């Protein structure tokens, strides 16, 4: 029974029914991962990774997921310097040739739109591991799985998206997924120079999702189930380091912020964090960003299985 | 029965009978690669890769070949920065060390002659994945396999070698292999500054192989079974990027060139290409460079099997 | 059916963690691993386990020997060959956050870092075993383990021997950890032979004096070498000199292992070097049977197989 997606590129590809089904597979993958026996579901399949930007979680969780299911991995951990991209090769030619050696490609690129172009080129599945400041659909998938796992529900919740929303490929993809549930309220909390872009706002409005911008993080956090913090995306600011430092340091998750949050609310962060979540938050049971990262293993196991061998 | 070569370093090591037999094995490997069952021919064997220059096809095709045969791989994707070559270690000490962890070494180096020095140090097989602007024997092997596969014949054909011939480790090795067949005519088409070096010319003349220099690519291409285009090798020009740019734009494979070529002729390119084959050409069935790269998987599977377990 | 018997260490971070009886037992395991590595059968001892490597400094032997060891035992590896450029350390992530995240994907972490003390911090953060593959100029405990194994294998003993530690002692994380392990045996005499600017640091000297280990500084390598069982040469640690290249160059060329040095050494003595070498062991020496540094490097495979097995599945 074939998986309905040929590639995982954009958050809009997912409907509510598909998300619930993927979450069920991820819970089964958690059982496999905990098990003593080595799974062979993906024995014989090869994944090629192509990372043109740095990564710890997304690269290693995809590789670990593949190996835990019995598959193998062909890595390119720095494609800008060590692949023939360094000789001038286009992404499209890279994808065309790498598909000759592999069964699925995981690619992170520095240009928005790169993953869509890769999927159009390739006749094997492509997974977008982040395309510039564009999208990050598997982050969004594991984020919603984490919320459902931590809060117990997705309908009716209030979610604060905090920090660099303009450049945040994570919060952009997450916004698309949250719009598939009902009675979700989203607060945008950011410096004005990195407010959420109009393509997301217009999509949410067209989808009848209530959203509000606010600069009062303590007030917003007091009434949210989820506070989703982000890193200010320095690599997207070019030479405008004045604007980078202007956007930094203005919205911090600290012990005082936790003190106004409900007992059953959570803090999330796709990671890495710099200064925007203080270290003393980590000890709070509501600090969910390391459980969130761990959950990416099971979500990516589920996606690799579904794309390669189906439901 | 053991393979007659202990290392794969230079095109001159091959003879016609050996080439034919390797191609026969590559065709069997294509059946293995297609099959549903994961092969175990090389279970228990370990390949070490040592890439001191960038690579996409050569590095990933060797790793994929090894894993498709059931073996494993110890990768060094950027030996200059991430291996103890960065501390000043010689190539010979690197090779002597790495053989303690592995059964076969695949090395791409920036100095011509490096692969022969590695083979002389090692007591396990070494494969030259490119040694500066010197040679690239497995590229030449897959190139001749591709010509036989596409054209149906090697004896009697006409082959144009186009582009940066002086620095082209690909065309240098290919010339050595073409010399092993009967009545091959080779055309050299290049800017004067990157014409084929005298060592190749003298070898061909001494071996009775007809070659001809021409600056009229349209005329040459109308007469050839194979037009083999190359990238101008920017990394060999040092800081003389003025002479590099001056050598570009003079010999382009475009739809106009395809328009004068015979119906049964092909375009080849070891890749990557920049501007020297236009995107239009890819849609012509005669554009063989992506099939060529795919064939490298099967040829490299054949070589690994032969070097490690024999016939 | 009583289950595993856990190794007494939870992490391999510092040479002082080892005791004499544990070292002897580890060496026995390494000899068993040599039989496994040589066998035509693929071992499955570590089937299903994953090692994450995190290399923030260059490596050939340490990185590849750990990966080869893991695979020869049937385990798998998640590599980060250049963590500074290709991991989210490049975005500014702390070591502690990196370790906490990477343990979610793996069962053991092998880390080489540029700061002394990094491995201690990683072990404190992680709830899976961490192995220190080198923490700045601090320590290199698995080099020291394979070094002592090599001495036992080549010389036949560790008690009573004389060992010359030669070269850059100040910055040598290898000789620093080796000194801690040599102190666990009886009547070992240690000679320090170095340029003054890279003499052995006081923390090691004070530890040896407190442990009753006789040590002596000398500038006469021919004299020292003639009365030692082991001459352990090192590379002058260029990267630790940073911009002070004039001091680096002046520390070179003073203490060379060459054919003349071998000529004054005993028949049964050996030359060791954790590698890489530059000029400080001449090529001539490689042909002498006493030149042990490539056997030493090979022995690292067996010692690291032993450590991975012990830390993941026990005795
Ligand atoms: O980098 C961020 O701040 C968020 C996000 N982070 C990740 O995906 C985690 P990693 O970079 O470790 O794979 C990204 O967009 O890459
Ligand atoms: O680089 C070229 O232009 C031709 C040739 N290309 C290859 O081998 C393919 P790759 O660099 O992707 O491994 C080379 O000499 O490396
Ligand atoms: O670098 C040296 O001179 C000694 C020592 N060398 C090693 O561990 C071997 P490698 O760097 O190849 O892993 C080190 O401290 O890293």
Residue numbers in the entry:
A (entry chain C), B (entry chain B): 80 to 390
C (entry chain A): 76 to 390
Paper quotes:
However, much remains unknown in plants about the unique organization, regulation, and localization of the enzymes required for de novo biosynthesis of pyrimidines, which are potential targets for crop improvement and weed control. This metabolic pathway starts in the chloroplast, where aspartate transcarbamoylase (ATC) catalyzes the condensation of carbamoyl aspartate from aspartate (Asp) and carbamoyl phosphate (CP)1,3. In general, ATCs consist of a catalytic homotrimer with three active sites in between the subunits that can be allosterically regulated by association with other proteins. Each subunit folds into two subdomains of similar size: an N-domain (aa 82–221 and 374–390) occupying the center of the trimer and holding the binding site for CP, and a C-domain (aa 222–373) bearing the Asp binding site.
To further test the role of the CP-loop, we replaced F161 with Ala (F161A). We also determined the structure of F161A crystallized with PALA. Interestingly, the structure showed a trimer bound to three molecules of PALA rather than one as in the WT. Although ITC indicated that PALA binds with high affinity to only one site per trimer, the high concentrations of PALA (2 mM) and protein in the crystallization condition must favor a low-affinity binding to the other subunits. Importantly, the three CP-loops fold in an active conformation, have well-defined electron density, and show no steric clashes around the molecular three-fold axis, since the bulky F161 side chain is missing and E160 adopts alternate conformations. We also found that F161A binds one molecule of PALA (KDPALA = 0.12 µM) with 5-fold higher affinity than WT, in agreement with the enhanced inhibition, and also shows ~100-fold higher affinity for CP (KDCP = 0.7 µM). Indeed, mutation F161A does not only turn the enzyme insensitive to UMP but also allows the binding of three PALA molecules per trimer, suggesting that the reaction can occur simultaneously in the three active sites. However, the activity of F161A is not 3-fold higher than the WT, likely due to the obstruction between subunits acting simultaneously.
